[model samples]
Target: KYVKVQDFYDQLGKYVLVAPGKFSGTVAATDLSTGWTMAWLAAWNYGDTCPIMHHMAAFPSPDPYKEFEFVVNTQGGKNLFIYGVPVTVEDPGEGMKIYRIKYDGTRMNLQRDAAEVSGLGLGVHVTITPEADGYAVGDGQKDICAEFDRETDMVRYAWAFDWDPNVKDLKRAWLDGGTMTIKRLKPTLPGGRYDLQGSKGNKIDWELVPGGELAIEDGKVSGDRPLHSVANDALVFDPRGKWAVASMRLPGVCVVFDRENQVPVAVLAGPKGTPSQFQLVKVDDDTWTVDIPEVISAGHQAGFSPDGQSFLFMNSLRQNNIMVWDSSNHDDPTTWEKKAVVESPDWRGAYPNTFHMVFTPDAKKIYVTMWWPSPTPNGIAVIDAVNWEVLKEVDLGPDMQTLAITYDGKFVVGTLSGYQNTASAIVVMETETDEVLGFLPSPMGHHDNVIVPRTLEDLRISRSTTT
Candidate 1:
């Protein structure tokens, strides 16, 4: 039995890698503190704002020790600051309201069916599903705990309580008399270990590819992909559904793994890179801004073209160049020959380096973020995908990082997670005219930017920023 990405679609966009959150032992850091594998908590949902997924959710947890207090006893302008007295199961919903982040919103009612009673084996848990067919998502989520969308990655800006509309607290774990439990179940490949198999078919056995500590994080990261860990940068899927290509920093290499296989097909090396960190004004609550800097030693990010016929990697900091190989030979990296290279512009005393990149839906051009960390008029660069060269640059203010495109491909959004002094912003622009729309100030420092998946169609394609 092999399980594939579709197997988790039933996870309904919630099945994802909590792997990036802090790890301690050969095990995981948050998990050791919380009593479960944060990396493999298969039951995790978009609305879970607990300590385990706090970092992954991009919230501020100055002290990971007092788990529940920092995340749960949230109120009075604290952590998400649920405006004026939160709506609890004990209270009615008419006099109050909760706001969702501006980009999207969710609408669904919860049920009180699952709670842990004295059991011999079965225990406590919370799950995120469609409740048959009525459930929906935005860049949003509505849980009494401010069950913000998992990938919602710190919008912390919702105003109304946005909990259950009908019974408001039936399934909420926080309110008085609510039913969902705080307990969780760890996941395993059905047959276990390298014997990986699914109820329906065989699947990927990650145990075979132990990327190790030197890999994802030895660096302290409070941010998310492309903006956070290096080796943990960007993981792109082949449109053909056969390969999973990603990057790493210490070794200064990119790895290409066949989706069905357990081990990496290729560990292609690249120019050198160094461990690094950047400052951010983390605004976890409505009122305060905590200066949390990002540690990004392990690095490099990449993505596939809209058509999947091509792929590219953007080397940042220590090296500012682009690398693409002949994606034709899927099983062999040795064949991904010299398609070409391009360096970030280091002109006028500013060493504006490169960060993440994304292709215009049409695949005609690529957007490479020219991040001037030392602070200049840092922006994004336009590259002719076919010619494999830098074409033009757009002035997008400072600290430009990741890129995201609209579903209709009408506009592109770029992020600027500036330092403590400078401002953080998101730059949106039109594709047709390639004109700068405006730089909108975000609440605190922001890192990654992405189009929220509106349907399962986009979900299957985007792979879980929602995953």
Candidate 2:
């Protein structure tokens, strides 16, 4: 489902391989998938050369233990090869898997696999179809521990809170879906017993929780938030609709949303008088108002924690400042407090001018991309979002831009520039080991990157269910 620059609008939902570049007369791989596939836009000169798509496919083997081989494919059968280099992949079960696909004229050994790849975290699918009354819930991954009906606004869940002692708690099982259900157990003003449950139904009680407990009055849930609230929250940004809430100042720095009944919960803005950052904006169905002025540095990318109680924003203004926020006072988005800031210092002629940020499906770690010029190398920084610490930094090359994690939580796919050359590579690194897994080539320039699975609806559901 790849599309060319001219056919972007013509072929919607289908992936677009390239778009017009920032500079006139140039083209780039701007609309590549960010989730499962590694691809980039490569071109020879400024705008004279036709855009090319050089990308590598790295995915998990359907078998949990077996490793899937990485394959490189081009848009127009263009071949790319680097001499005397074998890209290494971090093997979880074994030591390391080395892969080197040399040019054999037309193209490298390439064969697309149906179920050969998985995400870096547990793959959970949640679907919400708007019903005449409310919305019907569908779980492809069968991880629907609970479903919320908008018509009744009641939460229907399948958890054995008082099951047999010998039997494992149903709550414990939910974690595998990579879904985290934050339940309010206690009732107190600015207080409650918060229970974080996994997709498999495992539970972790919190002393202090956000959004409080779901109150039941007259046998109806008091909160009216319903089950699968996380998924519903994510429905606001479903890619199928291709909706976005853009800033007047910086349209590129915008919040994407689904066209149907979407709410502008947050926004990214860099107005003339204020420093660019994320603002907690209160949005109704028709209009939205900016509530909190300064949330975090206005930057490239932002993602929420699995529990939806925390968030991470990368200050992509070349500061390399990673800001963490906690939504304990969930009633008001403006009250979401800033927890910590992790800095990416200038190292080895490499400045921490970061670009994008993404959280692991489990909401444990976050990966930020460092986009920089020559002399300063570009790379990916792995940080412990919980502790606000730098875990590891894997340097790729100059102009390492957007990145996406695999479904099984095994690999991190990123885009790398050959730095003003006809060669750009998609670098795959292991999340657990933080080692370079492999590399694929792209033509012209690979600007924006995303991972597209067989179905984006499922991926959105997985993202909403988990984070």
Candidate 3:
């Protein structure tokens, strides 16, 4: 598949092949030895050098037949090498890492838990997550990996690993040992948590007990600590019982807060950051109420209930299912469950992938968009939040792309997905009636990103380079 801006959270050149036709200088011959879906570009351009990707983690592999590669910016160094060694000392900052490529039928069963993660490898399966004995993600997940939260410097660089952290070996089934989370630790000495009280300038300090929960303190982390940091988009402490985190690449990271105390009962990891790994963090004391179930994809879109109790959004990979997490109880918010709202023809290898999900204002229902299986338009899945049942499935005709639900709780709007030769239309549908309200004209190209309601004046939709 050719690289896409939506796949990686970077520019096209970073991952997409520069030349779509025959090979050229520095551009290696195209490799057509694997699988292809609508998610990838038709022709993949290879480079004598790898494309630039951010961050790296490594792990082991039992599938000896499987191979790996990466995409790096023209200004590069550091091979996408994995020998089970951590490489924090050297980072190009802008690059793509592929631990697995082209899944032929033969290696589908190869176990990844027994594999070793090494240099320059960001182990989504082996390297990430709070490791649990006997549990680990396997090699079948190689094609479903990506990276996020990358900064050039080691002390300043950070990334999250999204792999199913299982307790035993990952066989032919999902090793749902909850969600696995892995990140780079900057300044390998003493550790601490930093929160911006009012905004970026203001500071609120805290020390984290184990389990990554934080306790407020006097100032920023101290000592001759190396300059280590993670790049967070927009995070805020909402007075009305919730927190909002935003960055183009990461999903809408939101936390449902508790009013009585400035503590958040639930946290939603949105499409920003890296949408592949699923994560949920409780804002109250920085502990996880529910484990964000890990899938091969990222959770990009999310919204909270009016009373600040529940959350909803879409996962970008696997089956096109919308996710819901409950926060009825703040202290034990980890009570979340998942369902295949829009079932794919095959329980496994479902042809289409979901990009995001939106909820109606009253928070009674939701709208979702599906991709791949081209020639077929995006289908909006209407779900009843109260019973967690799919109320209806609306097929918005055909040739549709980029979608967003109005925040006012009225319309479901989106553009056409198929590239040129097709007129881009901004189609809107009423959430209640499940009917198309009308359509408007749009630009020729699909949106790299699309924001909602038009009410959020500063809202911006961003694209990705690595998927």
Q: Against the true structure, what is each candidate's TM-score? A: 0.48, 0.43, 0.40
Candidate 3, lDDT over the whole model: 0.31
Q: Quote the lDDT for 181 in model 3.
A: 31
Candidate ranking (TM-score, best to worst): 1, 2, 3
lDDT of 3 by residue, 137-222 (tens): 11111111112212111111222223233333222112132432332222223332212111111111111111110111111233
Query: Global lDDT of each model?
Result: 0.35, 0.35, 0.31
User: Model 2, residue 391: what's the lDDT?
Assistant: 84
Candidate 1 C-alpha error for residue 314, in Å: 2.1
**Candidate 3 ranges with C-alpha deviation above 4 Å:** 1-159, 162-181, 184-303, 313-320, 335-349, 397-399, 419-423, 447-467
Model 2 alpha-carbon drift over 4 Å, by segment:
1-298, 328-332, 346-351, 419-422, 454-467
Let me know the TM-score candidate 3 reaches against the reference structure: 0.40
Indicate the residue-level lDDT of 140 in model 2.
12
lDDT score at residue 271, model 2, on the 0-100 scale: 21
In candidate 3, residue 212 scores what lDDT? 11
Q: In candidate 2, what are the lDDT values of residues 1-467, reduced to their tens digit?
A: 87554442232223322221211213332232332222222233322132222222222223211222222211110111111123132221110011112222222232221111110101111122212111112111112222223233233221111111111222221111112222211212222211321122211111001111111111222222222222111111222232222211112123323323334344433222233335433333343333332212224344455445565544443234655556444444434556777764542222455545556667688777766555566788888877888888877776675566655566666666544452467676777767885565554344434443333332331223121
- CA RMSD per model (angstroms): 20.6, 21.5, 18.5
Error of 2 at 30 (Å): 16
lDDT of 1 by residue, 1-467 (tens): 77453432232222111121111101011221122232222112323222111111112122222221111000110112121224233321111111111101111122111100100010001111111111111110111111122232121111111111122322221111111111111123232111111111101101001122222232221112211112233334555555555443323445454434323445444542321111112133222111112112223555566566666665444445776655665555445654666654543222455655666656788777766544468787778888877778887675565565555556666656553236666576676777776654343333433443344333222322211
